[PDB]
Write a protein that binds this DNA or RNA. Structure first.
Ligand code: MG
Ligand code: MG
Ligand code: MG
Ligand code: MG
Ligand code: MG
Ligand code: MG
Ligand code: MG
Ligand code: MG
Ligand code: MG
Ligand code: MG
Ligand code: MG
Ligand code: MG
Ligand code: MG
Ligand code: MG
Ligand code: MG
Ligand code: MG
Ligand code: MG
Ligand code: MG
Ligand code: MG
Ligand code: MG
Ligand code: MG
Ligand code: MG
Ligand code: MG
Ligand code: MG
Ligand code: MG
Ligand code: MG
Ligand code: MG
Ligand code: MG
Ligand code: MG
Ligand code: MG
Ligand code: MG
Ligand code: MG
Ligand code: MG
Ligand code: MG
Ligand code: MG
Ligand code: MG
Ligand code: MG
Ligand code: MG
Ligand code: MG
Ligand code: MG
Ligand code: MG
Ligand code: MG
Ligand code: MG
Ligand code: MG
Ligand code: MG
Ligand code: MG
Ligand code: MG
Ligand code: MG
Ligand code: MG
Ligand code: MG
Ligand code: MG
Ligand code: MG
Ligand code: MG
Ligand code: MG
Ligand code: MG
Ligand code: MG
Ligand code: MG
Ligand code: MG
Ligand code: MG
Ligand code: MG
Ligand code: MG
Lengths: 118, 64, 145, 204
RNA sequence: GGUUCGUGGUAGGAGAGCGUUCUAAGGGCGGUGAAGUCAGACCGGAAGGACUGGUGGAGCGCUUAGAAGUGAGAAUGCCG
RNA sequence: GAAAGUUAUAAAUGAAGCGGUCUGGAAAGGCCCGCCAAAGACGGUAACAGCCCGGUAGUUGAAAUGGCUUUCCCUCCAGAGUGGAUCCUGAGUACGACGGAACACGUGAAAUUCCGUCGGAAUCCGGGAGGACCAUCUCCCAAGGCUAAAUACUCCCUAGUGACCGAUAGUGAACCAGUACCGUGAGGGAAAGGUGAAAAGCACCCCGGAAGGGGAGUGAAACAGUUCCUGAAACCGUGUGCCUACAAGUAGUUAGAGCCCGUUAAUGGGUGAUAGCGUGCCUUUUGUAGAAUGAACCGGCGAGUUACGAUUUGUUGCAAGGUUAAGCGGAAAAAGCGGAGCCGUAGCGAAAGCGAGUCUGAAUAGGGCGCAUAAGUAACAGGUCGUAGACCCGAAACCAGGUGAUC
């Protein structure tokens, strides 16, 4: 029996053009151009889930550094004192205190400063 | 159509009782003044088709 | 139960189709490689070809001849003949009567493999020396037809 | 083994069927194989397409091999052309095949003994009608509770049994030597007369 | 159901599957609106599958098997 | 040349529901009740009909012509044995030399058959063949002719079937198709199906020369109005929510304010100032973003298949056994019959031959191949191979029959 190729080719191709919604020009209209724009976007999104974790740690580090220099300390000396004393708070929350609750950040900076002095 | 048997191989090959192929040595025609008696006394015997050659000529002699 | 047919498991398999996309491993080149004589349609060499080197069958000599008057016998051993009853006149007609001998090519020859306990009176065209001796050791009698 | 009924629908004694025919353990793997082969041997296989050597036309090279700027072409009936030939397609062919004779006998016994374990076999004293009457067959067919598709197997009977059941939709009549795996499996119940049971056991 | 060791990949080997047309049996829905077509922010590990609404105006699914003219983005490919 | 019967070529009769009710433009549909059936095949009828129509099963029918069978008429006809004096039984024939061909057989140790050219028999006390040839034996009578059925094919007619196509498919041609068109000619050779159940195919009014529109009307529907069912994508436009004229860009992705919305309701939708990262897809390559190749875009079409054999794996039946082929039978069935044949059960040797052994050899030696140490077979499914175009497209060229000196 003959199997003519209807109703299946269009359904699969149209599902790709829908994912290319918002692209410039023919990248959201024509299948071939939109097909390789969808594959590239998946490739860009795959490795940007890795840099998103790198991008934020650099932001926290550069922000704890700014608040620590207001207490006659550098970031590196602050981190050495905290680990030496035993405080286990990570960069995400140390940066949170430096912006929202700067009063408590000075409390942690005192513990780090004392541990570096015996 | 049923496949044909290689007629040039059926004249000089021979099947044993275990499915192997037996042949004769191939340096005994006319230059017997250049070969020692030790060579000639051993080239008159028979030999077996090696495994490498067998895999290449299985289908040519399938029906004897 | 025509709506619940289930063939025996392992008795049937789904065939392989090549050249249907790269997600199946048999896509672009369809299991053929790249750009040879074996990658072409209808390509390939003879069954015994070796690319110009002399074939194996052409560096060994022929041997022998075929006898037109060759005689080939139907072989029955001693163990099969033990199924008869004592004193039975074993005859080539009886052998083909039971169907133990399907075709008597040029005759019947009894060989001496196994053992015989019944005292029989066998008849055939040929006997092996050990087979005739063994039958005579059990009070038998062999007469050549 | 089985209660024997009369045409009027009343009990009429008991009949014992052969245990080597109606009482063996069914082999379901065998029955499926025979059913598939019997269905595949029913198709005509009258189908065909035209190659590139059978479509009218072709031969002449459409244009010059080099210089024109078009692609290389050799005929207008090539497979990739609009009116060209088909590459492989169908061809006239037979599909029939047959299993070894002993396997075909074991499938008949198994399908004919599974209808006993399911209580779907009705032995009957004798079926006959003086004149063909489709109205009387329906009245008969309700005296015994079937209400579905059935296979009527009659050996002696008469010619009025086939005439008076031809118009019914799910009712088929066979003369007791045409019994087969596919026909038995295609129907729900199996009404067989006592005389037809004797002939069936004689064969197998 | 646990423990240990693993899980980049071209040519290539092995396995399990999705989807299309037709056939058989069972069971179904449809002028109170079938297939098709359009839109959507739903579901599955993938191929893919539902639901709701607009158009359309008469056919089409589901389950288990079977058979193939079986799935296209490229051939200076053919036609529009 | 007559008669009887049959059949083909027109046809006749032919059962049973206007059943009630719901939706609906329309009932054949849903629900609830009846009936016919040797008729529940097919098609039509305003949606899906055994009971509305043409019909169907069954039973009937032929003035006329063709066909067949039988009979009558008609026509024509000697067949058995015993003898064997004597006579007849296919002449430039059979054969042979030379040169070719057909025989599965390529001149070969080449029988057999045929052709051209030369030579050239016997004839029953005879002649030919049995794969050079001679002797014996066996079988048979050449150089004259005729012969039905079993076999091959389908331009056609009748009745049917399909796990065949469904308008780029299926015939080149579903439509005034070998047509239009192209060529001096032989020759090559298309595109093109669908209003609606019913034309009920828009009376009349308004703008306009008209075409074409806006009302009104028919219709279930006119966003069904004369390429008219459905009406996708490329492509062309109108309106609008967010952004955009100091900016260096494979156009996206990750973070993200502001503004605008409100979903298959869930860590929702649209657009996005700004910041980080980021050189298309395929092919061919040691290596390509590549200034190496292909693609203007969208849609349809477009490439490992089938038959017969070989081998290996899986499944099933039987098992030292397994299995039938052609064919008879039948419904394009299923049994049944059919054992002819094939594979296995024993191998070794060139062969005679011997045989659980055998060959080589002077050998009781040694060694090679085998048994000891035994599972095959039939059918189906997967992989691969062989013969076929064999995976799809592509040459320049070769041969055969023809058409051309209107240039
Ligand atoms: Mg179709
Ligand atoms: Mg397609
Ligand atoms: Mg955007
Ligand atoms: Mg020599
Ligand atoms: Mg697979
Ligand atoms: Mg691969
Ligand atoms: Mg590809
Ligand atoms: Mg390649
Ligand atoms: Mg290669
Ligand atoms: Mg041609
Ligand atoms: Mg040509
Ligand atoms: Mg065509
Ligand atoms: Mg991997
Ligand atoms: Mg890893
Ligand atoms: Mg594979
Ligand atoms: Mg469909
Ligand atoms: Mg819809
Ligand atoms: Mg295809
Ligand atoms: Mg592709
Ligand atoms: Mg394209
Ligand atoms: Mg009538
Ligand atoms: Mg009537
Ligand atoms: Mg109404
Ligand atoms: Mg009604
Ligand atoms: Mg009908
Ligand atoms: Mg309608
Ligand atoms: Mg209709
Ligand atoms: Mg000659
Ligand atoms: Mg001559
Ligand atoms: Mg003579
Ligand atoms: Mg002979
Ligand atoms: Mg001779
Ligand atoms: Mg003749
Ligand atoms: Mg066409
Ligand atoms: Mg169409
Ligand atoms: Mg002209
Ligand atoms: Mg008007
Ligand atoms: Mg007007
Ligand atoms: Mg109007
Ligand atoms: Mg109206
Ligand atoms: Mg319509
Ligand atoms: Mg339209
Ligand atoms: Mg559009
Ligand atoms: Mg500036
Ligand atoms: Mg600006
Ligand atoms: Mg730059
Ligand atoms: Mg950016
Ligand atoms: Mg860039
Ligand atoms: Mg390329
Ligand atoms: Mg290079
Ligand atoms: Mg190139
Ligand atoms: Mg280009
Ligand atoms: Mg394109
Ligand atoms: Mg192949
Ligand atoms: Mg087996
Ligand atoms: Mg017949
Ligand atoms: Mg039949
Ligand atoms: Mg031998
Ligand atoms: Mg030995
Ligand atoms: Mg010797
Ligand atoms: Mg001329």
């Amino acid at each position: 029996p003959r199997v003519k190729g209807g109703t299946v080719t269009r359904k699969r191709r149209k599902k790709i053009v829908k994912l290319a919604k918002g692209y410039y020009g023919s990248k959201h209209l024509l299948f071939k151009v939109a097909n390789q724009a969808v594959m590239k976007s998946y490739q860009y999104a795959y490795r940007d889930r890795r840099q998103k974790k790198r991008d934020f740690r650099r932001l926290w580090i550069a922000r704890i550094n700014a608040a620590a220099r207001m207490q006659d300390l550098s970031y590196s000396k602050l981190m050495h004192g905290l680990k030496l004393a035993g405080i286990d708070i990570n960069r995400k929350m140390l940066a949170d205190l430096a912006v929202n609750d700067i009063a408590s950040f000075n409390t942690l900076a005192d513990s780090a400063k004392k541990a570096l002095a015996k | 159509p049923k496949m044909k048997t290689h007629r040039g191989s059926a004249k000089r090959f021979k099947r044993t009782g275990s499915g192997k192929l037996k042949r004769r040595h191939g340096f005994t025609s006319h230059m017997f003044a250049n070969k020692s008696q030790k060579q000639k006394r051993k080239l008159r015997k028979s030999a077996m088709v090696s495994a490498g050659d067998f895999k290449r000529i299985r289908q040519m002699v399938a029906k004897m | 139960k025509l709506h619940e047919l289930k063939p025996s498991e392992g008795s049937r398999k789904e065939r392989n189709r090549v050249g249907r996309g790269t997600g199946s491993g048999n896509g672009k080149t369809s299991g053929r490689g790249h750009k040879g004589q074996k990658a072409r349609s209808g390509g390939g060499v003879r069954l015994g070809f070796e690319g110009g080197q002399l074939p194996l069958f052409r560096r060994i000599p022929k041997r022998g001849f075929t006898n037109i008057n060759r005689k080939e016998f139907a072989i029955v051993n001693l163990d099969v003949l033990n199924r008869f009853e004592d004193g039975t006149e074993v005859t080539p007609e009886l052998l083909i009567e039971t169907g133990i001998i399907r075709n008597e090519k040029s005759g019947i020859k009894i060989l001496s493999d196994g053992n015989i306990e019944k005292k029989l009176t066998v008849k055939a065209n040929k006997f092996s020396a050990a087979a005739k001796e063994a039958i005579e050791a059990a009070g038998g009698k062999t007469e050549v037809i | 083994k089985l209660s024997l009924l009369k045409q009027d629908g009343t009990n009429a004694g008991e009949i014992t069927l052969n245990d080597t025919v109606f009482g063996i353990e069914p082999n379901e793997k065998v029955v499926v194989d025979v059913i598939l082969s019997q269905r595949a041997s029913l198709r005509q296989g009258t189908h065909k397409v035209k190659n590139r050597s059978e479509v009218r036309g072709g031969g002449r090279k459409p244009w010059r091999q080099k210089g024109t700027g078009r692609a290389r072409q050799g005929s207008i009936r090539s497979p990739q052309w609009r009116g060209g030939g088909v590459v492989f397609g169908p061809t006239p062919r037979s599909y029939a095949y047959k299993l070894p004779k002993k396997v075909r006998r074991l499938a008949i016994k198994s399908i004919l003994s599974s209808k006993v374990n399911e209580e779907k076999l009705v032995v009957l004293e004798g079926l006959t009608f003086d004149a063909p009457k489709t109205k009387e067959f329906a009245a008969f067919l309700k005296n015994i509770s079937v209400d579905t598709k059935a296979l009527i197997v009659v050996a002696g009977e008469s010619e009025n049994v086939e005439l008076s059941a031809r118009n019914l939709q799910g009712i088929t009549v066979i003369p007791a030597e045409s019994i087969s795996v596919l026909e038995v499996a295609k129907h729900d119940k199996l009404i067989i007369t006592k005389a037809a049971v004797e002939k069936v056991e004689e064969v197998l």
